[PDB]
């Protein structure tokens with residue numbers, strides 16, 4: 257059973273709704289981004305039209321093996337007609353290829369679906385500036401005031417400076433970065449650049465990165481682990497046991513590991529500043545958890561919504577409990593009363 261919040265009223269469209277079989281009445285399936293909770297159910301045997309960005313389309317074809325005849329990539333920032341309805345894709349400031357979708361309904365209603373996003377003041381000068389939005393389907397992942405974290409720029413400055421210091425003190429240190437999906441590529445790219453190295457990884461992860469349209473990517477990444485002093489590993493391996501095991505495989509080239517776990521928010525955000533962050537250490541291994549978010553903080557989300565002034569908000573995250581739903585509804589009303597819409 258497809259939930260109501262994945263259906264767009266007055267259309268035959270669904271959004272991120274691939275795990276419910278054939279949805280009755282659906283003439284086009286939109287996919288906002290290539291994260292597994294959103295693409296769940298897509299496979300090589302899918303036979304309906306999928307609308308998405310070019311980058312998402314590359315990943316569908318190459319990683320999931322969806323046949324090319326069912327993949328409909330659309331350019332960003334461009335008015336397009338899909339089954340008789342005007343739509344626009346906008347950058348969501350999430351992972352590579354992630355979009356928000358503007359739907360212009362035949363009856364004059366305008367709907368914005370944010371997919372997953374990290375709201376930014378730059379969105380206030382997109383094609384959103386032009387007209388009124390009646391309904392907002394909102395990524396509410398962090399819709400509570402306890403969810404604070406730094407800018408992406410601040411977190412990258414910390415990572416670059418930490419890695420450059422450690423490897424300059426000990427040239428035989430290896431840097432490892434955890435990953436389990438697309439997104440957060442700036443973490444490993446920025447560290448490798450300050451160290452004058454390519455990033456080494458598995459054939460499978462290399463394939464994924466080759467789909468992302470990153471400028472000059474062949475200069476930045478490699479499958480030749482021996483040539484690289486920044487390695488990527490699955491997130492599940494970023495622990496003392498898994499890193500000890502990896503160090504053994506490196507043939508006595510290295511005598512220390514510095515590792516990074518990009519998380520989203522963790523409760524240590526409610527005490528500590530980024531500047532004060534310390535690692536967990538066992539012997540010659542140290543692990544840093546860094547709060548690199550690709551979702552809106554509470555303050556970023558509030559600013560975006562109070563600027564956009566929607567008539568109705570439909571949450572798409574944390575929808576499963578009465579407590580969560582009640583909390584979100586209280587915040588939306590505060591925001592509306594404060595700003596006067």
Ligand SMILES: O=C(OCc1ccccc1)N1CCC(O)CC1
Pocket residue numbers: 260261263264265266267268269270279280281282
């Ligand atoms: O039928 C609905 O949308 C139209 C639609 C039907 C089937 C496939 C795609 C789209 N909605 C919208 C939301 C309403 O609350 C109740 C369900």
Ligand code: NI
Pocket residue numbers: 289291350372
């Ligand atoms: Ni996501």
